[PDB]
Every structure is written in structure tokens, then in C-alpha cells.
Amino acid sequence: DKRNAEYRLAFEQLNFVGADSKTPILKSFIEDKGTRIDEITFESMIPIETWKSYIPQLQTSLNISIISIEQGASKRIVIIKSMAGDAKIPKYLPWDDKYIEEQEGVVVVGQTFSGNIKIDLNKSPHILSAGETGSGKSVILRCILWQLLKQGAIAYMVDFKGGVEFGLEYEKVGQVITEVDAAEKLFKYLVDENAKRLKLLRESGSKNIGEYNKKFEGEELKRIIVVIDELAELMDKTGVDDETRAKLVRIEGYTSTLARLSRATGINLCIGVQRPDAKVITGQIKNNVPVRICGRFADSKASEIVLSNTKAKDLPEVKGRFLFKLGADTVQFQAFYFDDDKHFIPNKILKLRK
Ligand SMILES: Nc1ncnc2c1ncn2[C@@H]1O[C@H](COP(=O)(O)OP(=O)(O)OP(O)(O)=S)[C@@H](O)[C@H]1O
Ligand SMILES: OC[C@H]1O[C@@H](O)[C@H](O)[C@@H](O)[C@@H]1O
Ligand SMILES: OC[C@H]1O[C@@H](O)[C@H](O)[C@@H](O)[C@@H]1O
């Protein structure tokens, strides 16, 4: 057993032995081939505090990035959460207009171990971005929005916090919705537009809008991008009056309809969530939004609501580091940093539209 031998040598070189004069014995090594976050279990007579003093050295000796070291079942077992030293992903990756894909509908959200995370909205039509305050889960949505705007999409932005998350500059490129009445009128219009698009597809014998657009020289349907800054603002009906609750009941239905039926019509939903709750990230939403982008959560319950797994509690504490899920994949990636002050240039969008 080569690996066991290598570790024994690395610890012997450090004279890293317990009160029994024994180097740590390797017990388990559970590896995640998607996130590249391993779980390394050891049995030693060495206190956890000595292991933590050796973090810098142990990283170089074992050639791993240590995320955490913690005590297990007994004060004789330690668990190391780590990534291999050869599993390099940047800790900082700024956005560059060079990452924009020429293929209409394709977006790039960041970098994984080998290459970029690309989402084809013609295949995976909706994106859910989950993350706590200061994670950068909204930076991802504005990045996606930028790329789609650069490809000539029509945009709608939903933020009931008076549109702070999308100021005056965003209003030059699209409609910023800040009230429940405007959201109800918007979502009703979106369900109706979607229904008109479906009948165009059925009538013309087209599989998607791309095919329909080939058939009609001057009647081209544009991709509609809808950015919902906070899903809970639409889904939580508590503490509102009878009238407002009924408006939110109806918006919940329009959103369900859109997520389910807007697949080949080019009407994409990019939803932000801060607090994973099954009353917000509903069975209907989860079943119809294939892409999940997830920041680090301390509670495995929060991660299970978003990803149907506990991997988001294992993420490194690096700002911009996220998990990407599409079907069977739960992949670690460093999101591009889309800085509004440097990167959101509204006049480039207005020039390209002609
Ligand atoms: N992709 C990223 N790469 C590096 N730093 C990032 C990234 N995203 C955000 N940050 C930083 O982390 C902090 C996040 O704050 P904001 O930029 O306001 O994020 P946001 O996208 O609006 O996210 P929240 O969840 O809604 S506060 C800032 O100090 C950013 O500089
Ligand atoms: O869904 C497609 C994506 O799958 C991921 O597993 C890969 O790491 C990405 O590079 C790719 O774009
Ligand atoms: O909010 C609904 C309205 O959205 C606008 O962007 C459209 O141009 C209108 O036709 C529509 O009635």
C-alpha cells in the first residue's frame, strides 16, 4: 500500500508521533470526484491542537490544501477535510469580456479544476443561485445577465428592496421591478408571452425559438432573461395584507408555470436565494430549475434544500468559491468576479442593440 507508506514516511520525517511513540495510522480516505474535497481519517495519540499547529507543514508534507481538522468519535481520531495540492482553482478570478461565448444562449460562470463552467440555456433553461450575505451569489446572476445582454437579450430584474441590487444603470438596459403589483403584471405578461411562443412553435413545427427564428426573416423572437434577486420576496406570504397575499399566490403560480413550460421558448429565470427554506425553494421550483449554484452553508439542511446533498458545508472559506450542480454533477468552481463599477457598461449594450 503505496499511499499508507508515503504518509508514514512524511510523519516519520516530522517525528510526528503520539505519547505511544506512534505516527498517525490512516483509517479512511473518502474522495469526492466532483468537488475534489477529500475526507482523511487518522488514529493518533496527538491532540487536535498539535495537528492544527502542523497545518502549514502537513500541507507540504502530504501535498494537500487543508480546509479543516476536527475531532471525531474519540479523542484518538482526527478528520481532515482537504483538497489535493494539484487540484488548483484560483482564489480570485475577475470577469473579462473575453469569456463571452459566441453561441447564443451559452454563459460562463467561472473556473473549475480543468476549464470553465459553461451553461447552455437552450439545454438547462433556469438557474438557482444560493448563498448567504457576502457570498457573491448575486454577482453570478449579474454576470450571467451581462453575458445575455451582450448577446442581445431583453431583461427584467426583480428586487423588492427598492432596486438597490440593480440601480439606475440597470434601468437603461431593462425594467427594474420593485413592487408586487408590477411583479404580478410582469409575470402574467411572461406566462402569456411564453404561451404565445409555444403556439408559434406548434404552428410552425419548430422544436425551439432558434428553429422558428430561421423560418421568419423579420419576426425574430428575442431571448428574455428574468433575474429574481430574492426568491423569498415572492414565496414568503407572511405579514402581508389579504390583497398582497393574493398577489403573491398568483405570482407563485406564474413562476411555477414558467419554470415548467419555458424550456424551448427562450424565457430564462435566474433566481437568487439567501436562506434555503423548503417553503421558498419548493418541490416545484427544484424539479424545474436544473442548475444550482451554491455558496458555503454551515447547516447541511440548507445545502440539502438546494442541492439534495450536504456538500455545500464542506466548501473552502474563499470568497467567490461555489458549488455547481446539473444532474449528477456537484462541482467546485471559482465564480468570476463581476464588479459593476468596472464591468457593467450600459452604453455598450445600447450600442450593440443599434
Ligand atoms: N466572484 C467573486 N470573487 C471574489 N470576490 C468576490 C466574488 N463575489 C463577491 N466577492 C466579494 O465578496 C463580497 C460580496 O459582496 P457583494 O459584492 O455585495 O456580493 P453580492 O453578489 O451582491 O452577494 P450577496 O449574497 O447578495 S451580499 C465583496 O466584498 C466582494 O468583493
Ligand atoms: O454541464 C457542463 C459542465 O459540466 C461540468 O462537469 C464541467 O466541469 C464544466 O466544465 C462543464 O461546462
Ligand atoms: O410589465 C409588462 C410589460 O412589460 C414590457 O416590457 C412590455 O414591453 C409590455 O408589452 C408589457 O405589458
Nearest CA among 57, 150, 137 for reference residue 100? 150
Which residues have a Cβ under 8 Å from the Cβ of 263 and sit 6 or more positions away? 125
CB atoms within 10 A of CB 9: 12
Looking at the domain assignment, is residue 318 inside a domain? Answer: yes
**126 touches 289 (CB < 8 A):** yes
Whats the size of the chain, residue-wise? 354
Tell me how far apart the alpha carbons of residues 279 and 354 are, in angstroms, rounded to a whole number: 43
Tell me how far apart the alpha carbons of residues 110 and 116 are, in angstroms, rounded to a whole number: 6
- 211 annotated binding-site participant: no
β partners of residue 106: 120
Triad 354, 139, 240: Cα angle to 5°: 100
- 137 annotated binding-site participant: yes
Tell me how far apart the alpha carbons of residues 234 and 105 are, in angstroms, rounded to a whole number: 26
Q: Whose CA is closest to atom 4 on ligand 2?
A: 117
Looking at the domain assignment, is residue 120 inside a domain? Answer: yes
Tell me how far apart the alpha carbons of residues 298 and 195 are, in angstroms, rounded to a whole number: 41
Tell me how far apart the alpha carbons of residues 69 and 56 are, in angstroms, rounded to a whole number: 12
Q: Is 295 in the pocket of ligand 1 (CB under 6 A)?
A: no
Nearest CA among 170, 156, 162 for reference residue 258? 156
C-alpha cell at 207: 422544436
β partners of residue 310: none
Looking at the domain assignment, is residue 294 inside a domain? Answer: yes
Q: Whose CA is closest to atom 11 on ligand 2?
A: 117
**45 touches 18 (CB < 8 A):** yes
**Interval between CA 171 and ligand 3 midpoint (Å):** 14
Secondary structure (H, E, C), the chain: CHHHHHHHHHHHHHCCCCCCCCCCEEEEEECCCCCCCEEEEEECCCCHHHHHHCHHHHHHHHCEEEEEEEECCCCCEEEEEEEECCCCCCCCCECCHHHCCCCCCEEEEEECCCCEEEEECCCCCEEEEECCCCCCHHHHHHHHHHHHHHCCCEEEEECCCCCCCCCCCHHHCEEEECCHHHHHHHHHHHHHHHHHHHHHHHHHCCCCHHHHHHHCCCCCCCCEEEEECCCHHHHCCCCCCHHHHHHHHHHHHHHHHHHHHCCCCCEEEEEEECCCCCCCCCHHHHHHCCEEEECCCCCHHHHHHHHCCCHHHHCCCCCCEEEEEECCEEEEEEECECCHHHHCCHHHHHHHCC
Q: Is 59 exposed, middle or buried (0-12, 13-18, 19+ CB in 10 A)?
A: middle
Tell me how far apart the alpha carbons of residues 82 and 326 are, in angstroms, rounded to a whole number: 24
Looking at residue 129, its amino acid is S
Q: Is 313 exposed, middle or buried (0-12, 13-18, 19+ CB in 10 A)?
A: middle
Shortest-distance atom of ligand 3 to CA 154: 6
Nearest CA among 328, 272, 312 for reference residue 127? 272
Which residue of 158, 189, 223 sits with most ligand 3 atoms within 8 Å of its CB, as the best mutation to test the pocket? 189
Looking at the domain assignment, is residue 312 inside a domain? Answer: yes
Give the range of the structural domain holding residue 129, as residue numbers without chain letter.
97-353
Looking at the domain assignment, is residue 68 inside a domain? Answer: no
**251 touches 114 (CB < 8 A):** no
Tell me how far apart the alpha carbons of residues 254 and 244 are, in angstroms, rounded to a whole number: 15
CB burial string 242-252: b at 16+ within 10 A, e below? eeeeebbeebb
Shortest-distance atom of ligand 2 to CA 115: 10
Which pairing describes strands 329-335 and 321-326: parallel, antiparallel, or unpaired? antiparallel
**88 touches 46 (CB < 8 A):** no
Tell me how far apart the alpha carbons of residues 121 and 230 are, in angstroms, rounded to a whole number: 21
Give the domain CATH number at 331: 3.40.50.300
Domain total in the chain: 1
**What technique was this entry resolved by?**
X-ray
Tell me how far apart the alpha carbons of residues 275 and 220 are, in angstroms, rounded to a whole number: 39
Residue carrying the nine cell digits 404565445: 196
Which residues have a Cβ under 8 Å from the Cβ of 287 and sit 6 or more positions away? none
Tell me how far apart the alpha carbons of residues 334 and 160 are, in angstroms, rounded to a whole number: 29
Looking at the domain assignment, is residue 218 inside a domain? Answer: yes
Which residues have a Cβ under 8 Å from the Cβ of 23 and sit 6 or more positions away? 8, 11, 12, 16, 17, 44
Looking at the domain assignment, is residue 66 inside a domain? Answer: no
* Distances 53 to 62, 73, 294, 321 between C-alpha atoms, Å: 15, 21, 31, 25
**Interval between CA 232 and ligand 1 midpoint (Å):** 20
**Interval between CA 183 and ligand 1 midpoint (Å):** 26
Looking at the domain assignment, is residue 1 inside a domain? Answer: no
